[PDB]
Design a protein around this nucleic acid. Sequence first.
RNA 1: AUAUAUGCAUAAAGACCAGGCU
Lengths: 156, 746, 169, 171, 167, 332, 46
Amino acid sequence: SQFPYSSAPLRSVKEVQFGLLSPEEIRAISVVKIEYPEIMDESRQRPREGGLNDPKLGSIDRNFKCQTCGEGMAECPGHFGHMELAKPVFHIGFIPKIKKVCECICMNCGKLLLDETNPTMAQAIRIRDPKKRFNAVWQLCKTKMVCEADSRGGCG
Amino acid sequence: GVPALFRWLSRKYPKIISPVIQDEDVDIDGESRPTRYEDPNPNGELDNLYLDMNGIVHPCSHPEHKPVPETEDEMMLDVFAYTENVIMMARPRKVIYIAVDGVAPRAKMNQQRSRRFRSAQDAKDANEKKAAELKEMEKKGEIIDDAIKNKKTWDSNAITPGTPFMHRLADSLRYWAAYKLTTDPGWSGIEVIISDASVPGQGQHKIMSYVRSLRSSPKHDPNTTHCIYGLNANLIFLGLATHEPHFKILREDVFAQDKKSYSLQDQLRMTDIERQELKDKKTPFLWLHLNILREYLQIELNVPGLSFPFDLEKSIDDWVFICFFCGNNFLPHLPSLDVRDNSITTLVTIWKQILPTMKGYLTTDGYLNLPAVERLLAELAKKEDYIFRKRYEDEKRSLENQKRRKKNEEIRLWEPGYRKRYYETKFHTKDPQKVKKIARNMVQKYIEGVSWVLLYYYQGCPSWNWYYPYHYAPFAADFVNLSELKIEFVEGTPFRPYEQLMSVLPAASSHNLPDVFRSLMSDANSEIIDFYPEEFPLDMNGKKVIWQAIPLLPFIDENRLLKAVQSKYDQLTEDEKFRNTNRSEILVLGRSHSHYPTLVKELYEEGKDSYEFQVDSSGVSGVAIKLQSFDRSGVLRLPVKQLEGYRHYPDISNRDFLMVEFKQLPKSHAKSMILSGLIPHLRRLTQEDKDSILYGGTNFYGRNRFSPEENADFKQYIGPHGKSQYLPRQGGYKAFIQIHSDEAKG
Amino acid sequence: NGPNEHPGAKYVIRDNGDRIDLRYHKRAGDIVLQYGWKVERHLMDDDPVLFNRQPSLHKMSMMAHRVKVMPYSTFRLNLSVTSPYNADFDGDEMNLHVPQSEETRAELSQLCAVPLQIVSPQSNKPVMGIVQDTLCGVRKMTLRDTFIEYEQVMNMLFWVPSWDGVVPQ
Amino acid sequence: MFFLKDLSLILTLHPSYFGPQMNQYLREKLLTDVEGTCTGQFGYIVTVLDGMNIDVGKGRIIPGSGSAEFEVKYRAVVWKPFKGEVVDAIVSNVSPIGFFADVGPLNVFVSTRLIPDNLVYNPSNSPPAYMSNDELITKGSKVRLKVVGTRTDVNEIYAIGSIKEDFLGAI
Amino acid sequence: VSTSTVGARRRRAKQQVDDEENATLLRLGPEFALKQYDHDGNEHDLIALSLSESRLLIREALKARSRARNGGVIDDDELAKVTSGAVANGVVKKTLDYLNTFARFKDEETCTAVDQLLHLHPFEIAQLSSLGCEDVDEAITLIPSLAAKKEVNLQRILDELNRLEDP
Amino acid sequence: YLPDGDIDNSIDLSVGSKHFLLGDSVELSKLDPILLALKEIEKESGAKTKDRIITWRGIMRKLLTLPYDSEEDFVLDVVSFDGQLFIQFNVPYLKSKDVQKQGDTEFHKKLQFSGYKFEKMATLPKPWPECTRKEIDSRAKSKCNNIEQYGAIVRTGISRIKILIGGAVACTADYYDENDPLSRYIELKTTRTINQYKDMIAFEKKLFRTWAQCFLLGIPKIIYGFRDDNCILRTVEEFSTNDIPLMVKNNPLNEQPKKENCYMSSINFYGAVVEWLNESVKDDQVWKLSYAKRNRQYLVLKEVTDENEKQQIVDSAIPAWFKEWRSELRNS
Amino acid sequence: KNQFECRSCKNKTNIYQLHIPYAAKLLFQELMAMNIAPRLYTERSG
RNA sequence: AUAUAUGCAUAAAGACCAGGCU
Ligand SMILES: [Mg+2]
Ligand SMILES: [Zn+2]
Ligand SMILES: [Zn+2]
């Protein structure tokens, strides 16, 4: 009850939804773009604008308040930024799973090697749980090694 | 950086300073609503607003950081915009008093002359260095436009009554007031009083005199609320002299105003988009409430153990007198009491140490009590040994720290018998009898000067001819046998605008002054050539600021200066003679105002020469006189050439407003006490600062931020909360009912 | 009384949440409390506190006790609660937690209280019993050839808190 | 403009008011805190209907605080501005930079750019007015406008209107 | 502060463009859509109140509040004084002063006749029973809802509005 | 003029009681000023007035306050002259009252002087802007008496009856209003400090009495200085004459003592008694009305038939100059 | 100044407040930094 | 017109390594 009063209603978390952050969402939630390698300007405080310690990111000291939320370090939860990459980079935690996807879809038309015509694939589709459904699809589609031209839209 | 005399009241009274609710500006896309006047003021309702117009026109004549406007039409438009913003921020609903500093009295004349001389000198040095740099980079190949070569720096000495610029400013202010009254639906019930530079007086003095004249009417409402806008901090002590609790001061913000120094490159070649951004940069403002200050001083000054009943009004008067004694423009500060406001910190405690023993108050309705101030100064002299020891110890400790980390003066005040050596250092006289006589005369003149200063802000100007004939002041123990001294004043007559123009303007800033008197500064055969030397000595007295040093100058001789001035009235034209006269205030009244039909009937219909007001709808009081030059069938045009995109001003017909000559009520001996029927504001101090200002409980805990945002409401604490003059207390019937109703409920 | 003298208080919480420190408040002798305020008083007698020894193998290793303020710097324990805590007095260190709300005080008093934990659900048998010297003592006390004179009987009867005041034949 | 809406409010009741008259106290809180307010999603709230016997439901005891939370569902009448909707109004202030008009509690501002060139402001008129050939708009005169913008500050709604279309003007 | 029955509408991968409000395109936003939900969650049509209907419902609500508070006892000032709170009182007097002067049908018999006559987007009937209409051209010029209906018959309905209802 | 500083300073009210001056009851109760002002209004009017009963304020105050606050006996003489009514205190009753008052110990005179001292201390002889500092700080060093006074004569009406009421006015708010003098008038009274229910009841009774006193002259505002048993001004507060009945009835501590408001019935009784006097006395008649302890149910009125008693009552009631001026007016 | 805004969803009204451990806040921020989006919803979609 | 600023009365190192305690 020591927090300052807020007009927003207070409740409790009832559901937690997990997922991946899309690049559009990452750009939207960000408040500043980080592009300058340097930290200080000429070593007289006043950190670099757009650097790793931009004042818009947040406030960690009572001398300067946050430039985005306007509160001190006791209330500001911190604000995220975005950094654009020149080339795409793999995710180390997603190295194997992507490869598994590479064994499921075609590398030219981006289509699955098997369709609903196959009976085993048809049964594997009806699995409600995504994890075991994906496991079954990968196990069934890793055996075939050629994209079928016929149609299913395959490139042959 | 916050200045002194204001940082101290931030430290000691942090709770009176409040921020301002600026505006709302644009809400919908494209153009938006202009925030019409009739909406309630979020800062609290305000009736009377008194504007110190000189403090509005001077910084928006030469901004320090904002790039300098060119020409003078843009200057007038900028003044119009700033005044409109200030009025919309304060939102007065009864009276706007536009007061411009007129002909100053003789007491301030020496300071005025020093300030004008320094302004001319450093402006000349600055433009000489600027031209040298222009030539230097011309040798480097830089291109300079004609708007920068021929156009020199604007002379700040032009802010002086009698110059054509003041006439243009007065005409522009009259036109702007008439236009605002005739086009704004929210200004229908407002009377605008203009007291331009033609009217003798000085700004805040005119405001104080008007408030005093208002208080002299028995029908005056004591619940009216006043506000003063001004850059001078002394107004903080001026409002407490009015003894009107519903009082406040609007000031430019100092804490949050991160003033960044800008060079000429940040003025000349910076872009027009940034020009508009700086124009639209909402400068924060501070509300400084004086009722909260009175609440603080009611508890602070309530020292126990007194042989006489405690009166908060006389204590307020004594506190204001001490504050004026510590520092004022008319008299130089004492040698002992120095480092500005810390002196105020000292004497008050001295007063607290001497009040129980003394039987009488220091001042009574602006009149000094000689024995009381004499014993106060005697105790100050007794402590002068410790004060001099402390300040010289601070100086020597600064010298030691500097050593560790890295007219001839040489007085050495730490040695005994420093008074005589200081006397021959400042006077070059070794005769003990002459030194004693000079010291006695200086003491008598300084007593007369503090009396003059205290009467000036309390009972009007007592003498327009008095002036301090020295450059320094004696120490406290020189003030002995003060009851024997006699003080007398002669009212005299205020000087003509041309006389003050002669007195304060230098020889290097005579372009604005008419060519008739130019030979009185330029010709070497002139009999008054000696009052304007090219260079003058400066006595530092020990400091580092250039202009804070003593400006050693030949004192003006009044008699022959007068003779020279009156020897050359026959060469002036009709307009120059009309600019060399003193007139009365101007009252401007709307067509839809309730007082308009009555004034028209009593002036332009009944043929009467004068009409008496007393209390009216707008709360003014005085005498209205028909003004001959005002033709009702004419058209009032803007005296300023219109620039691009500055809110095009149409031509105002004279049938839509009335302009009359205004006089105040006859002068009377004003008392220092609250009127009957006053409704106190809602109590704002709650059992924390009340004992913090008394004991050491959370008083020295330094919170070095002092941001005014900690209150952020300042709304219910403005108007006269309640409907009873006397608050419930002890065993009154209504109080009894209230307290037992509360007890039954809880 | 102040924070330096027991019993006393440390802080005074206003209705709006402002805190007054009694250490720096030297004029606390003439302060009045308002209804709805909170006073952070010292730990008094009969205050339920959680009391724990690590590692906590089972629920009996963390129980609610009643505070008795005593001199010296060691926690005092009954000898019968050492076995559920699996503790001895050769240098053991134990922890104490103070609830800060009425609901959690009631929860500790009605759920985690020591008397409610005498019988454990692991083997439907008690986990606290008469141990160490007392046990040996009763073996030397209830022997057939043990006889007590009148004065010692009166002293022992008075030593019983739950004695009914009737001397048996 | 006037719409009928279904609203729900969460009300917190202190334990000090846990008495037999708590239903009436909750009703009084609802009456105080609904009418006269404005919201971004719903607009200005005009008033509530059938509030004498509204169902307050059962309270929710907040753990650790002891206050009771009530979810009150009710039927109310509200007022919300619309883009492009024409409406009749009575004007209040007339200025060269524009003039205001009142539609219920809402103030709609019409800028000078949005008046046809036939109407001309004149300060000499009593009261000051926009006049034209057989056209007169003083203070307090009935006018027709079309909303061309709305913006919300949670507490209030601000709108701008235009009279630059056919069959729009004073009536 | 207050909430309605319609909610949820969490974030989706693809954003929606048709979000801004415009009465010319007959778009009212998610809050005031064609179908709303009652206490039990059943689908119901949007309820639009015309100025005469709004006047009747406000008078009924104020008289019900007077019955609840005073207990069985006419003027706009009295109805404004029925409620409490400075903001609420100001809002209610402002809306009553706006509504009484611009109410086309101020009597209950004409209100009942309009009910019947009215007996189609509710915004259309609200705007027809809200603002004065005398000609087909001005009716379609003021708001384009009547311009494109494909079953217009504005002649007969406007003749009814001018003669059967209050001219 | 009285700021909060005077209240905070605990101004004593019993100081100077040794040299307090008293006025004669007969001289102060005479109708000389009212009859005189009648003489000027008659001279500069030229025709007889429309008033019916001519009297002081205190007589009607007591006669209206009687039904509910009746701890004082009164006998009054009524003279019907030229169609007008003159009401005065009975001269034998005046001397009996003086005799019984001469032995009233010292507490009652102490309270009376405390009230007069509060009146002297709370007011100024001139408006505040025209007053000096000597005339403000010397209020406590002045002389207090009841002879020195200022009064107003006001025409009031009730039912179909016109009354010319003379009454003393303590002071005015800030200035004299020529448009409506009665709007700025103000009355000052002193009561003991309130500390319990008995004090509440006593103060409500005093409030009803002084409201009856003040409402006759139409004075809107009243001021009350509450003092302790040491005659020290403890507090001060304001009241409005029109607002007294509503706040008295709607008292949170005692919301329902009585379903019958005393004020409305007091007005009704005043109307009944004034019409009773209107059509109970004929022309050229002298009557005596009375109320004492023994009745407690009714007021007694009798007609005097003694020639000597009637002549002496007329002589002691109406001065010779008024009679001769009336005769001159009748002749002219 | 009582201003709540969400840049991504252009929201200013449907915003709630929660009381959570600071370690939970740090964990959620780190998960966001690792391209994982844990969304806290106060209502059950069902 | 003010007047310069020449001033600041609490900030919280954390991460690893080694040796012991029950
Ligand atoms: Mg062990
Ligand atoms: Zn932040
Ligand atoms: Zn393929």
